[PDB]
Amino acid sequence: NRVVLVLNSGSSSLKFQLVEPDSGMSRATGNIERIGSSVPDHDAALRRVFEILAEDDIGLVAVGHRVVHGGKDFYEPTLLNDAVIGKLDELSPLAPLHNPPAVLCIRVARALLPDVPHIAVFDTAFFHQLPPAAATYAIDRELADVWKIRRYGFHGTSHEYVSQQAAEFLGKPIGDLNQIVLHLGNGASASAVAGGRPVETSMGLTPLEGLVMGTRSGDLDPGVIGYLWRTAKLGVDEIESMLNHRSGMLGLAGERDFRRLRAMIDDGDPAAELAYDVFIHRLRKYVGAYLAVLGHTDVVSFTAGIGEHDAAVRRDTLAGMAELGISLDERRNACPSGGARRISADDSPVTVLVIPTNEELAIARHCCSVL
Amino acid sequence: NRVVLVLNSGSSSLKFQLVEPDSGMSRATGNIERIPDHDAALRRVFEILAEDDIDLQSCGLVAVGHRVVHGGKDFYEPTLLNDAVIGKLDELSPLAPLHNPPAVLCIRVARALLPDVPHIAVFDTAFFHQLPPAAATYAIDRELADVWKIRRYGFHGTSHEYVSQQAAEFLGKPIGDLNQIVLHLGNGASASAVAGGRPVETSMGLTPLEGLVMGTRSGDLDPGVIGYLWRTAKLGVDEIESMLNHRSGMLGLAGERDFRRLRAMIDDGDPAAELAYDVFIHRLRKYVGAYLAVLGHTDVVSFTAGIGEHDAAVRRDTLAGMAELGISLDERRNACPSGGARRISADDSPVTVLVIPTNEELAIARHCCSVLV
């Protein structure tokens, strides 16, 4: 019956999805790409989103706005208005490229749909309460406080969601489990969650830190930027742009997609082989690091596009881990299905799951939370 | 009966040590800090050695060992120095523009004043040359990485190498049979993972700033932090990096780098000191976890260097609550005031834990004599 509209705007894109909270069904789903030839302006992106919804004959309650960065101040699903929107515009320097498109969309959206309330859900919100020892970078304290620099973390809605679904799958209270969640998508991040409360995550001040990703470097010697600047004589924006768009798997092997990368490795391409090896090794390190942080771990869950469907990634990440409590059973891991499932061996002290993520559904239920 | 003078040049300092490699005895040790210049600095050393009735022109010195921070891709063994090799070294300097040129300069001064003896350079990156490609490659643009020679080089190589040998000897097992973690915790700090004697990971990277939280260095840091300080705080690139290297770590978080002084501030209930200490320990525990996973099976973990050798509390807090990863300490063995190579794990710890005093100068002396015979 009741439906929420979840929106997600980039600088040349407006993803959308109509969704029912109480049942979980998704009434419709799209994303208007290349914005900025055929679809020029974000007003004409949401307008063209109505011609799509019309052509399938389209019981609303709210409109959910996906915002990437909530700074120190926004870590709850927040009711929007002109005053709240005001404070949002001030967050933008924390996320200079990612956030303004969602402020833009807040205002184009609320302008063109005053019927329902608009509620904002932040991708940093889940990690607000990371413990100080994990949230603090070891840099000059004054600069850190003045410029609001800490580990904020991202993929918050996904890590939270999956941790709740893992609890349910196992039939135990979220309060009694220690978990690792591995969100392997276009972007990739890891979390450690102790009793439902997050205690580490791999992304940082920005979505660049941590795991190797499609186009992002992840962890990098802090000296690399300076080196490229004073010796290669490249500009800082160029350097950072390269780190977000010309690094990771694209930078190492010339290919993002892991099914394509597989074919390249099957065909004996060394560069694709090295790139895959770099990705897996980086992830293995984060699994180990977070087992230590937790001390005792009950479950590890994979989620997101690569996590849900690449059996070779799951196998290689957790190979040779029996002395740390993890064993996979390939009969379960090698068998493609959708849905929540168990892929660990029956005698594995740590349980390994696949849990499909539904960021848009979790964003819908939170919106109700605020009503 | 025979010795090697081991030298270590900083931007304003000159550490030296005359070591018997067979003996392992240090005939003399010192450090001319403050540096008129390196020509003089080395002159002022000759006098001290004479002030203990030692004259280098006659004492069985077979070699003068020169420590260099960055060996690049091409220098990864002890390297008998001549004018050609020294011309190539100058080309490396942009890979370590602050650490290397000082050592190149002292190589000049020293080859003139001690000509009747071979000069041999040993590189702090050398041990890690052999890191597997999956560990040594940053996930950035290949072309830039290639042309600018950007990879995980690693540092504290002499120490990690030495401690991995000493650990094996201590346990009575050949080094080819052990998987090890070494935690070199000094003013600078780094971790390594060594499989049958070959390093398979280490925490420092292109430069000595990656990895662990240190005395005045940040260690691991979101690359976005630097860009953000540049475009929003509008600080210069050189200033940011200098902050990261000199005004970060424990000094940056607590205003104090010394761990005994830090201990005292913690006992007197200073909250910045306590958060600083927690940040340090949390970062270290992640690395032990990471490197346990890289190795699969780990036989031994060894602490070394100033803090690793002397701070029972750092060792206790690093490895607390790790029984499910195979590690448990024995409180009494850990608190033992006695120095020297020793075991600190419980009898029931599948992973053995050791303290191994490091002696880089001796390791370098022996490397210097490796190149002779």
PDB file of N, CA, C and O in Angstrom, chain B residues 6-17 30-45 65-69 98-107 109-110 187 246 257:
ATOM      1  N   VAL B   6      80.639   2.042  11.172  1.00  0.00           N
ATOM      2  CA  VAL B   6      79.294   2.183  10.584  1.00  0.00           C
ATOM      3  C   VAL B   6      78.808   3.614  10.748  1.00  0.00           C
ATOM      4  O   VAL B   6      78.786   4.125  11.858  1.00  0.00           O
ATOM      5  N   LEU B   7      78.429   4.250   9.639  1.00  0.00           N
ATOM      6  CA  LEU B   7      78.080   5.672   9.631  1.00  0.00           C
ATOM      7  C   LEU B   7      76.669   5.930   9.103  1.00  0.00           C
ATOM      8  O   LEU B   7      76.171   5.217   8.234  1.00  0.00           O
ATOM      9  N   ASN B   8      76.054   6.994   9.603  1.00  0.00           N
ATOM     10  CA  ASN B   8      74.637   7.242   9.398  1.00  0.00           C
ATOM     11  C   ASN B   8      74.347   8.748   9.392  1.00  0.00           C
ATOM     12  O   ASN B   8      74.226   9.366  10.448  1.00  0.00           O
ATOM     13  N   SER B   9      74.237   9.330   8.198  1.00  0.00           N
ATOM     14  CA  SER B   9      74.232  10.791   8.023  1.00  0.00           C
ATOM     15  C   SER B   9      72.818  11.347   7.947  1.00  0.00           C
ATOM     16  O   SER B   9      72.023  10.914   7.111  1.00  0.00           O
ATOM     17  N   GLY B  10      72.517  12.300   8.831  1.00  0.00           N
ATOM     18  CA  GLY B  10      71.264  13.055   8.794  1.00  0.00           C
ATOM     19  C   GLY B  10      71.503  14.470   8.294  1.00  0.00           C
ATOM     20  O   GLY B  10      72.643  14.894   8.115  1.00  0.00           O
ATOM     21  N   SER B  11      70.424  15.209   8.075  1.00  0.00           N
ATOM     22  CA  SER B  11      70.522  16.566   7.534  1.00  0.00           C
ATOM     23  C   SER B  11      71.406  17.479   8.386  1.00  0.00           C
ATOM     24  O   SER B  11      71.965  18.450   7.872  1.00  0.00           O
ATOM     25  N   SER B  12      71.515  17.175   9.681  1.00  0.00           N
ATOM     26  CA  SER B  12      72.371  17.932  10.601  1.00  0.00           C
ATOM     27  C   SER B  12      73.086  17.052  11.638  1.00  0.00           C
ATOM     28  O   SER B  12      73.615  17.568  12.637  1.00  0.00           O
ATOM     29  N   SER B  13      73.105  15.738  11.403  1.00  0.00           N
ATOM     30  CA  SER B  13      73.649  14.775  12.363  1.00  0.00           C
ATOM     31  C   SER B  13      74.566  13.744  11.700  1.00  0.00           C
ATOM     32  O   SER B  13      74.486  13.507  10.495  1.00  0.00           O
ATOM     33  N   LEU B  14      75.439  13.140  12.503  1.00  0.00           N
ATOM     34  CA  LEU B  14      76.329  12.079  12.027  1.00  0.00           C
ATOM     35  C   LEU B  14      76.586  11.034  13.117  1.00  0.00           C
ATOM     36  O   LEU B  14      77.477  11.199  13.956  1.00  0.00           O
ATOM     37  N   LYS B  15      75.794   9.964  13.088  1.00  0.00           N
ATOM     38  CA  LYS B  15      75.956   8.836  14.003  1.00  0.00           C
ATOM     39  C   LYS B  15      77.039   7.889  13.462  1.00  0.00           C
ATOM     40  O   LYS B  15      77.190   7.714  12.237  1.00  0.00           O
ATOM     41  N   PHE B  16      77.800   7.296  14.382  1.00  0.00           N
ATOM     42  CA  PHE B  16      78.897   6.414  14.013  1.00  0.00           C
ATOM     43  C   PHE B  16      79.046   5.315  15.041  1.00  0.00           C
ATOM     44  O   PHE B  16      78.674   5.491  16.190  1.00  0.00           O
ATOM     45  N   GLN B  17      79.596   4.181  14.627  1.00  0.00           N
ATOM     46  CA  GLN B  17      79.801   3.070  15.540  1.00  0.00           C
ATOM     47  C   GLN B  17      80.832   2.122  14.948  1.00  0.00           C
ATOM     48  O   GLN B  17      80.700   1.692  13.801  1.00  0.00           O
ATOM     49  N   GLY B  30      78.977   6.668  19.035  1.00  0.00           N
ATOM     50  CA  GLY B  30      78.662   8.065  19.282  1.00  0.00           C
ATOM     51  C   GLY B  30      77.837   8.685  18.182  1.00  0.00           C
ATOM     52  O   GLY B  30      77.417   8.008  17.235  1.00  0.00           O
ATOM     53  N   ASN B  31      77.619   9.989  18.312  1.00  0.00           N
ATOM     54  CA  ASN B  31      76.771  10.737  17.392  1.00  0.00           C
ATOM     55  C   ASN B  31      77.051  12.244  17.482  1.00  0.00           C
ATOM     56  O   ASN B  31      76.767  12.880  18.502  1.00  0.00           O
ATOM     57  N   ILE B  32      77.621  12.799  16.413  1.00  0.00           N
ATOM     58  CA  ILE B  32      77.933  14.223  16.349  1.00  0.00           C
ATOM     59  C   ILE B  32      76.696  14.962  15.852  1.00  0.00           C
ATOM     60  O   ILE B  32      76.546  15.203  14.654  1.00  0.00           O
ATOM     61  N   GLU B  33      75.806  15.292  16.790  1.00  0.00           N
ATOM     62  CA  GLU B  33      74.564  16.033  16.511  1.00  0.00           C
ATOM     63  C   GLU B  33      74.831  17.538  16.366  1.00  0.00           C
ATOM     64  O   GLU B  33      75.897  18.012  16.752  1.00  0.00           O
ATOM     65  N   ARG B  34      73.875  18.277  15.795  1.00  0.00           N
ATOM     66  CA  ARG B  34      73.920  19.762  15.743  1.00  0.00           C
ATOM     67  C   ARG B  34      74.436  20.390  14.431  1.00  0.00           C
ATOM     68  O   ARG B  34      74.039  21.510  14.091  1.00  0.00           O
ATOM     69  N   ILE B  35      75.319  19.679  13.722  1.00  0.00           N
ATOM     70  CA  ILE B  35      75.957  20.160  12.476  1.00  0.00           C
ATOM     71  C   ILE B  35      75.141  21.200  11.698  1.00  0.00           C
ATOM     72  O   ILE B  35      75.715  22.173  11.169  1.00  0.00           O
ATOM     73  N   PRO B  36      79.630  22.284  12.554  1.00  0.00           N
ATOM     74  CA  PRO B  36      79.753  23.213  11.431  1.00  0.00           C
ATOM     75  C   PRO B  36      79.260  22.627  10.095  1.00  0.00           C
ATOM     76  O   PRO B  36      78.314  23.159   9.514  1.00  0.00           O
ATOM     77  N   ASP B  37      79.890  21.548   9.627  1.00  0.00           N
ATOM     78  CA  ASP B  37      79.456  20.829   8.413  1.00  0.00           C
ATOM     79  C   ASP B  37      79.917  19.355   8.433  1.00  0.00           C
ATOM     80  O   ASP B  37      80.606  18.931   9.363  1.00  0.00           O
ATOM     81  N   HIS B  38      79.538  18.576   7.420  1.00  0.00           N
ATOM     82  CA  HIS B  38      79.859  17.137   7.401  1.00  0.00           C
ATOM     83  C   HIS B  38      81.316  16.841   7.203  1.00  0.00           C
ATOM     84  O   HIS B  38      81.800  15.794   7.649  1.00  0.00           O
ATOM     85  N   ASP B  39      82.030  17.744   6.532  1.00  0.00           N
ATOM     86  CA  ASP B  39      83.489  17.668   6.454  1.00  0.00           C
ATOM     87  C   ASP B  39      84.070  17.725   7.863  1.00  0.00           C
ATOM     88  O   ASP B  39      84.899  16.895   8.247  1.00  0.00           O
ATOM     89  N   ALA B  40      83.614  18.709   8.631  1.00  0.00           N
ATOM     90  CA  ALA B  40      84.061  18.883  10.009  1.00  0.00           C
ATOM     91  C   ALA B  40      83.532  17.747  10.882  1.00  0.00           C
ATOM     92  O   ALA B  40      84.298  17.125  11.618  1.00  0.00           O
ATOM     93  N   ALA B  41      82.231  17.470  10.774  1.00  0.00           N
ATOM     94  CA  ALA B  41      81.574  16.414  11.567  1.00  0.00           C
ATOM     95  C   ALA B  41      82.388  15.121  11.581  1.00  0.00           C
ATOM     96  O   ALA B  41      82.614  14.537  12.643  1.00  0.00           O
ATOM     97  N   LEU B  42      82.853  14.700  10.407  1.00  0.00           N
ATOM     98  CA  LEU B  42      83.680  13.501  10.300  1.00  0.00           C
ATOM     99  C   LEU B  42      85.086  13.708  10.873  1.00  0.00           C
ATOM    100  O   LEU B  42      85.699  12.755  11.368  1.00  0.00           O
ATOM    101  N   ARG B  43      85.600  14.940  10.786  1.00  0.00           N
ATOM    102  CA  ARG B  43      86.874  15.305  11.418  1.00  0.00           C
ATOM    103  C   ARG B  43      86.773  15.225  12.950  1.00  0.00           C
ATOM    104  O   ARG B  43      87.656  14.666  13.604  1.00  0.00           O
ATOM    105  N   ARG B  44      85.696  15.773  13.509  1.00  0.00           N
ATOM    106  CA  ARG B  44      85.450  15.712  14.956  1.00  0.00           C
ATOM    107  C   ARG B  44      85.255  14.279  15.497  1.00  0.00           C
ATOM    108  O   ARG B  44      85.492  14.041  16.690  1.00  0.00           O
ATOM    109  N   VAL B  45      84.826  13.342  14.638  1.00  0.00           N
ATOM    110  CA  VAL B  45      84.758  11.918  15.006  1.00  0.00           C
ATOM    111  C   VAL B  45      86.145  11.296  15.165  1.00  0.00           C
ATOM    112  O   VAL B  45      86.387  10.583  16.147  1.00  0.00           O
ATOM    113  N   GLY B  65      81.086   1.466   6.497  1.00  0.00           N
ATOM    114  CA  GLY B  65      79.699   1.213   6.092  1.00  0.00           C
ATOM    115  C   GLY B  65      78.848   2.465   6.104  1.00  0.00           C
ATOM    116  O   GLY B  65      78.816   3.188   7.096  1.00  0.00           O
ATOM    117  N   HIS B  66      78.157   2.715   4.997  1.00  0.00           N
ATOM    118  CA  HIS B  66      77.327   3.903   4.838  1.00  0.00           C
ATOM    119  C   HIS B  66      75.892   3.516   4.743  1.00  0.00           C
ATOM    120  O   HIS B  66      75.504   2.806   3.810  1.00  0.00           O
ATOM    121  N   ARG B  67      75.083   3.994   5.685  1.00  0.00           N
ATOM    122  CA  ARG B  67      73.648   3.743   5.668  1.00  0.00           C
ATOM    123  C   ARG B  67      72.974   4.744   4.786  1.00  0.00           C
ATOM    124  O   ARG B  67      73.200   5.936   4.947  1.00  0.00           O
ATOM    125  N   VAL B  68      72.154   4.250   3.859  1.00  0.00           N
ATOM    126  CA  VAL B  68      71.358   5.085   2.969  1.00  0.00           C
ATOM    127  C   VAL B  68      69.886   4.656   3.081  1.00  0.00           C
ATOM    128  O   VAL B  68      69.583   3.467   3.046  1.00  0.00           O
ATOM    129  N   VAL B  69      68.979   5.622   3.205  1.00  0.00           N
ATOM    130  CA  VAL B  69      67.551   5.335   3.409  1.00  0.00           C
ATOM    131  C   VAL B  69      66.864   4.699   2.185  1.00  0.00           C
ATOM    132  O   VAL B  69      66.186   3.661   2.306  1.00  0.00           O
ATOM    133  N   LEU B  98      64.748  14.322   1.271  1.00  0.00           N
ATOM    134  CA  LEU B  98      65.286  14.742   2.562  1.00  0.00           C
ATOM    135  C   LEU B  98      66.248  13.718   3.185  1.00  0.00           C
ATOM    136  O   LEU B  98      67.251  14.092   3.781  1.00  0.00           O
ATOM    137  N   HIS B  99      65.966  12.431   3.047  1.00  0.00           N
ATOM    138  CA  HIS B  99      66.813  11.436   3.694  1.00  0.00           C
ATOM    139  C   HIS B  99      68.072  11.121   2.924  1.00  0.00           C
ATOM    140  O   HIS B  99      69.132  10.979   3.522  1.00  0.00           O
ATOM    141  N   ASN B 100      67.999  11.026   1.597  1.00  0.00           N
ATOM    142  CA  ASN B 100      69.158  10.550   0.821  1.00  0.00           C
ATOM    143  C   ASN B 100      70.344  11.527   0.643  1.00  0.00           C
ATOM    144  O   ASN B 100      71.494  11.153   0.907  1.00  0.00           O
ATOM    145  N   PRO B 101      70.086  12.765   0.196  1.00  0.00           N
ATOM    146  CA  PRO B 101      71.234  13.656  -0.103  1.00  0.00           C
ATOM    147  C   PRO B 101      72.260  13.772   1.034  1.00  0.00           C
ATOM    148  O   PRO B 101      73.455  13.734   0.758  1.00  0.00           O
ATOM    149  N   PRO B 102      71.805  13.870   2.305  1.00  0.00           N
ATOM    150  CA  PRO B 102      72.773  13.817   3.409  1.00  0.00           C
ATOM    151  C   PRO B 102      73.715  12.601   3.399  1.00  0.00           C
ATOM    152  O   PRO B 102      74.888  12.745   3.706  1.00  0.00           O
ATOM    153  N   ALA B 103      73.219  11.420   3.052  1.00  0.00           N
ATOM    154  CA  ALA B 103      74.078  10.228   3.038  1.00  0.00           C
ATOM    155  C   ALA B 103      75.040  10.225   1.843  1.00  0.00           C
ATOM    156  O   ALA B 103      76.158   9.714   1.936  1.00  0.00           O
ATOM    157  N   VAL B 104      74.581  10.779   0.726  1.00  0.00           N
ATOM    158  CA  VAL B 104      75.415  10.973  -0.461  1.00  0.00           C
ATOM    159  C   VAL B 104      76.581  11.931  -0.158  1.00  0.00           C
ATOM    160  O   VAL B 104      77.711  11.678  -0.568  1.00  0.00           O
ATOM    161  N   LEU B 105      76.295  12.999   0.586  1.00  0.00           N
ATOM    162  CA  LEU B 105      77.301  13.986   0.997  1.00  0.00           C
ATOM    163  C   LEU B 105      78.379  13.425   1.935  1.00  0.00           C
ATOM    164  O   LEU B 105      79.566  13.722   1.778  1.00  0.00           O
ATOM    165  N   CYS B 106      77.960  12.631   2.918  1.00  0.00           N
ATOM    166  CA  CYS B 106      78.895  11.985   3.852  1.00  0.00           C
ATOM    167  C   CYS B 106      79.718  10.905   3.158  1.00  0.00           C
ATOM    168  O   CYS B 106      80.862  10.656   3.538  1.00  0.00           O
ATOM    169  N   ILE B 107      79.133  10.258   2.153  1.00  0.00           N
ATOM    170  CA  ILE B 107      79.899   9.360   1.296  1.00  0.00           C
ATOM    171  C   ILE B 107      81.052  10.124   0.624  1.00  0.00           C
ATOM    172  O   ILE B 107      82.161   9.602   0.546  1.00  0.00           O
ATOM    173  N   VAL B 109      82.651  13.182   1.653  1.00  0.00           N
ATOM    174  CA  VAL B 109      83.588  13.493   2.722  1.00  0.00           C
ATOM    175  C   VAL B 109      84.422  12.278   3.147  1.00  0.00           C
ATOM    176  O   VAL B 109      85.635  12.384   3.295  1.00  0.00           O
ATOM    177  N   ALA B 110      83.778  11.129   3.315  1.00  0.00           N
ATOM    178  CA  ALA B 110      84.422   9.954   3.912  1.00  0.00           C
ATOM    179  C   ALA B 110      85.362   9.203   2.973  1.00  0.00           C
ATOM    180  O   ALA B 110      86.337   8.599   3.424  1.00  0.00           O
ATOM    181  N   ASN B 187      61.314   5.502  17.371  1.00  0.00           N
ATOM    182  CA  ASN B 187      60.790   6.850  17.079  1.00  0.00           C
ATOM    183  C   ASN B 187      59.905   6.816  15.846  1.00  0.00           C
ATOM    184  O   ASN B 187      58.808   7.364  15.860  1.00  0.00           O
ATOM    185  N   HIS B 246      56.122  15.781  11.002  1.00  0.00           N
ATOM    186  CA  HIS B 246      56.751  16.411  12.188  1.00  0.00           C
ATOM    187  C   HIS B 246      55.805  16.845  13.269  1.00  0.00           C
ATOM    188  O   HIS B 246      56.233  17.038  14.405  1.00  0.00           O
ATOM    189  N   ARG B 257      55.873  12.946  22.523  1.00  0.00           N
ATOM    190  CA  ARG B 257      56.241  11.742  21.748  1.00  0.00           C
ATOM    191  C   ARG B 257      56.845  10.612  22.605  1.00  0.00           C
ATOM    192  O   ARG B 257      56.738   9.432  22.246  1.00  0.00           O
TER     193      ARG B 257
END
